[PDB]
Each structure stands twice: as structure tokens, then as C-alpha cells.
């Protein structure tokens, strides 16, 4: 029913089993370990539940402004034992600020380390020896904070587990161990990372993002470790993996154990999961262990995701008419690229036109509507905007269709034979002369001139949209930037039927990402237009 209620029973079954493994890259540059077993976790989340029972009532938030590791995971485990919504944030921000104003949280929970009382569960005595509620568990970050209840979780990892597992009859090998270096405080992070362990029933090897970001290959050699791993990315981060390993790390490495690692959060590539997969088989990684995943915060955080028992199917589509809005199969190398996902079973998905809350026909590109319990209720205190982004209600339903609540995602694609495909987020688009260009298509044109980071976005200027590119190069003459400006202007020119307006030639490091390294194609818009970019002229 509930997770402290699940975590409860982890702990009648299996009082001494690994349930959390934290390694810290900080100290150590190969990693200190720390471990709890189930019993040790409860004891933890049983104290820190105390200590919030202090300050805050049933139903009020808790904010948990810590970095990652265990203290983080009782932290969040403590506030729902205590019945309190909990909310997961980054430690620092005045973007931090803008949610607590927002969800006026009765405790803030933190550490030494970093008016509503503070507490530092680090200081507290966690391990000294010794209710929940049942709909609202916590809230995923105007900032506006998604509603999870716990009826939302349990549903998507009934639908998760089914997908993921289809050809072992929904039941999850007894090998099976999650391991993640995703930050807490997203979507993806905080359900692999914190939730699934006690609701599948397996331990987590946990880490931080920013010991990922320091040398990529610790993430292959955690996975690596005993057993079959479940583990998840961001496709970029498939990219930096596939480039930045030394196979002197990867020495005698086995990765044919390793059950499924998720890529999603963003586009999925092919080329960069080809990259990945032509030089980690070596070490036996299996294909068919790369599983493309869609989702949104909105719906948990799953929709559909690729056939269990094979590697990701890839379709290909003429780009001209893509931009006209339909979508041709063409021959195989011909076209765009693009990764296909089965329809799934639970959620269903509706590709729906925006402007007159009708279905469109197979082929024809309009936006993806989302039904299902996996979908979250609304935004906290946010009657206005829920309305916008849940009431989704679909005009003249098809045969099997509901007519509502529909999730709108604001997420561009299309149906084709059964199967359908993400374009990319509709305000991220490029729109010159009627036609639709994603920023995914543009930059993958400029990431393999230079092969760093790039971010196409789109500047109105009296009346229409200019492409405008930012391109991370590498610092180490005023020549041979001729020679890559030209050389890009032309590779979009040809490769998209584009005009650049500018192109912005920075330094490594520039151009804003997240924690797990989402291009910020948002911030990019204004720091260009407000000036803001050094070019390396
Ligand atoms: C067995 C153990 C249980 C498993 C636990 C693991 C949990 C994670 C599994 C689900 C992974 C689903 C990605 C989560 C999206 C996210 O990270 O959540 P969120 O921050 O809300 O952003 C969402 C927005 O990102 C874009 N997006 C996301 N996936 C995209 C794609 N495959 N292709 C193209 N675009 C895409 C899209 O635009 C969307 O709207």
C-alpha cells in the first residue's frame, strides 16, 4: 500500500539483507562504501521520523535540502513514515527558495554540512534503538510541484515491472540489484534510487553525479559488481561513457550480467547507442540490455518503453515531410532516425492535435496525450494550471479511446504501424516558413563536426524565428575557427535546409546543463539575448 508499509515488510522478510550501498568518490578516488540492511534503514527512517514529529503535523511538507547519500534516503523515508508530503531538492539558490515559498514546509530536513525549523539528520543519533498517510506522498519540482501519491507509484512500477520484464512473466530476476549515479532530486533519480529498492525488493549501489561526471567508467564498474544490474542514464550520458572510458578501468570487466540500463530523460539517439554498444561488447555487453524509456514527471515517471527480449528497434522517416508534419517510412539509412516505441499497454497513449483536442491519423504528427493511474493529479496549490495540463479531453474519441483526464506533455509525435515516436518538446521546436525543426536533429548535425556540446535554439526577431546555435569548442587560431564556423554553417544548410542567423563559438563549459547534463535549451534563449556569451571570436 504505502512505502513505509513496504519498507516494514522488507524488513520482516529480510532483517539483514543489503538494502542501500553508498560509494563516496570525495575522499577516495576509488570510493569509500557504506552499507544498511533493512533493519538498519528502518532504524534510521524510524528516528528521523521522530525527530519531524516534533516540528511538523500530518500533511505538512518537508523539504530535504541534502546532498546525496544515505542521509538523503532517511531523510525522504523519515518524512513519509511521519506522514508528512515529503519534497526532494538539490542542496544549494533562489530557485530553491521559489519552491519553499510555494510549498511552505513546516521542517527542512539537512546536514551540518549545508523560520521553519531546520534539522540536521546527520547529527542526529540515527542508529540509537528504539503515522503515514496513504494518499500524497511527495511533491516532484513558476515552479510547480507534481502530486505523487502513493497510489501513482505502485500503479507505474505495476506497469514498469510488466514492460521490463515481459519475457520473464513480470517477475524480476532473484540476481537483481539497482545501481544509479542519478541525483536524487529528479524524477528518474529519486523512483530507481530511493523508492524501487523497497517496493521491487533488491539493494541499490548508489553514487553522485558529480563522481559519474569526474570519470564516466565508475558507472560500467559498479554495474559490473555481483549480480544483474538495473541501472539508468540520460542519452548524452551514453555519449560521455562511450568516449571518456580507458579500457585500463574496464580490465577484465564483465557486463553480460547486467539486466537493464534505461536510457531516457531526453531523445534517444541511435548514434549514440551505437557508439555505446560497439565499444562496451567487447566486455559482453548485451544489446538487448538497452532499453529506450519515455515518461514525464507528470505521469511518475514512465509511459512506454522498447520489447523486452530485444535490442531497440530503429525507424526511418523522410525528413521533408517530417517537417511538413507527416511522417513517410523510408528504406533503411535513408531519412531521420528515429528510435520506435510500442504502443504501450498501461498508460495508453494518444497522439492528439493541440489546436482542436482531436486524435490525428496514423502518420501525422500532433501532440502526445498520456491516460492512466500513473498520472499525477495536479500541481500543489496550482487549481489554474492543473486544469491546463491535466484536463486534457479528446473530441469525438475513437473506438477504445476514454475521453479524459488526457496529460498534455507538451511532447511532439507520431503513430506509424502500431508504433510511436517522440519528435522532441513542442516549445523547444524551430518553426521557419511553416515547417517544424527539432533542436535534437540540429545539434546532432553539429555534434559530430565537433563533438562537443551544442544547443539549437530559436530567437524571434520582428516576427519570425532565427536559428541561432551555441557550439562548445575546445580553448587549446583565428583560422581553423573558419574553418569549423564554415564548416558547420554548411552542414546545416545541407542537412536541414537552415540558415544560420549566429553561431556563438564558446568555451568548454559554457552553455548551461543540468546535474546529469540536460542541455538547458530555456536559459540559453536569454543569456544570448541578454549578451551574455564570451565567442572566442
Ligand atoms: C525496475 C525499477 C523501476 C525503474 C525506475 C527508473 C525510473 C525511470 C524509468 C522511466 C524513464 C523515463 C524518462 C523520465 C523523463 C524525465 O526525466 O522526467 P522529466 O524531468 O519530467 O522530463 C520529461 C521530459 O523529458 C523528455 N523525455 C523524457 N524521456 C524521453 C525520451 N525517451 N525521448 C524523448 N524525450 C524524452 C520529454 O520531453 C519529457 O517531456
Known amino acids: 500500500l504505502s512505502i513505509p508499509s513496504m519498507l516494514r515488510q522488507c524488513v520482516n522478510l529480510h532483517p539483514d539483507g543489503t538494502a542501500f550501498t553508498y560509494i563516496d568518490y570525495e575522499r577516495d578516488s576509488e570510493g569509500i562504501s557504506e552499507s544498511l540492511t533493512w533493519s538498519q534503514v528502518y532504524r534510521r527512517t524510524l528516528n528521523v521520523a521522530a525527530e519531524v514529529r516534533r516540528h511538523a503535523a500530518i500533511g505538512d511538507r518537508a523539504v530535504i535540502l541534502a546532498p546525496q547519500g544515505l542521509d538523503y534516503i532517511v531523510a525522504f523515508l523519515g518524512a513519509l513514515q511521519a506522514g508528512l508530503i515529503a519534497v526532494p531538492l538539490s542542496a544549494p539558490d533562489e ?32 542508529d540509537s534503538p528504539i503515522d503515514s498517510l496513504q494518499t500524497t506522498a511527495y511533491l516532484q519540482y513558476t515552479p510547480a510541484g507534481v502530486m505523487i501519491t502513493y497510489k501513482n507509484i505502485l500503479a507505474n512500477f505495476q506497469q514498469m515491472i510488466s514492460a521490463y520484464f515481459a519475457d520473464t512473466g513480470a517477475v524480476p530476476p532473484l540476481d537483481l540489484f539497482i545501481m544509479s549515479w542519478l541525483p536524487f532530486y529528479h524524477d528518474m533519480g529519486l523512483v530507481l534510487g530511493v523508492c524501487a529498492p523497497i517496493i521491487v525488493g533488491c539493494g541499490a549501489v548508489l553514487t553522485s553525479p558529480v563522481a559519474f561526471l569526474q570519470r564516466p567508467a ?26 571518456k572510458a580507458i579500457d585500463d578501468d574496464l580490465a577484465g570487466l564483465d557486463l553480460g550480467r547486467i539486466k537493464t540500463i534505461l536510457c531516457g530523460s531526453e ?28 515518461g514525464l514527471a507528470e505521469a511518475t ?61 496514423p502518420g501525422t504528427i500532433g501532440e502526445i496525450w498520456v491516460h492512466g493511474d500513473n498520472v499525477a493529479g495536479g500541481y500543489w496549490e496550482k487549481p489554474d494550471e492543473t486544469e491546463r495540463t491535466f484536463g486534457g479531453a479528446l473530441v469525438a474519441p475513437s473506438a477504445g479511446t476514454p475521453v479524459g483526464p488526457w496529460l498534455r506533455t507538451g511532447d511532439s509525435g507520431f503513430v506509424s504501424e502500431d508504433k510511436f515516436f517522440i519528435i522532441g518538446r513542442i516549445k523547444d521546436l524551430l518553426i521557419v516558413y511553416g515547417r517544424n525543426h527539432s533542436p535534437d536533429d540540429i545539434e546532432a548535425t553539429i555534434q559530430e563536426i565537433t563533438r562537443g556540446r551544442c544547443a539549437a535554439i530559436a530567437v524571434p526577431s520582428n516576427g519570425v524565428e532565427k536559428l541561432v546555435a551555441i557550439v ?29 542567423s549566429d553561431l556563438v563559438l564558446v568555451a568548454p563549459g559554457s552553455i548551461p546543463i543540468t546535474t546529469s547534463g540536460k542541455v538547458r535549451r530555456a536559459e540559453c534563449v536569454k543569456l544570448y539575448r541578454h549578451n551574455e556569451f564570451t565567442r572566442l571570436d
Open 301 to 361: 515517471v514512465y509511459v512506454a518503453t522498447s520489447q523486452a527480449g530485444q535490442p531497440p528497434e530503429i525507424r526511418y522517416f523522410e525528413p521533408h515531410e517530417l517537417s511538413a508534419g507527416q511522417a513517410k517510412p523510408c528504406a533503411t539509412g535513408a531519412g531521420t532516425a528515429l528510435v520506435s516505441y510500442p504502443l504501450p499497454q498501461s498508460p495508453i497513449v494518444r497522439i492528439v492535435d493541440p489546436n482542436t483536442n482531436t486524435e490525428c491519423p
Open 218 to 243: 565508475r558507472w560500467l564498474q559498479l554495474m559490473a559488481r555481483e549480480g544483474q544490474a538495473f541501472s539508468a542514464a540520460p542519452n548524452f550520458a551514453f555519449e560521455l561513457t562511450a568516449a
Open 95 to 126: 530557485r530553491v527558495d521559489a519552491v519553499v515559498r510555494d510549498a511552505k514546509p513546516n521542517v527542512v530536513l539537512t546536514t551540518s554540512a549545508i523560520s521553519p525549523p531546520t534539522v540536521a539528520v546527520d547529527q542526529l543519533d540515527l
Open 267 to 294: 531523445r534517444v539517439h541511435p548514434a549514440t547507442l551505437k557508439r555505446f554498444v560497439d565499444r562496451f561488447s567487447r566486455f559482453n555487453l548485451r544489446e538487448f540490455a538497452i532499453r529506450p524509456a519515455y
Open 472 to 500: 562548445e569548442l575546445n580553448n587549446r587560431d583565428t583560422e581553423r575557427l573558419s574553418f569549423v564556423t564554415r564548416e558547420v554553417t554548411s552542414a546545416i544548410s545541407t542537412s536541414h535546409g537552415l540558415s544560420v
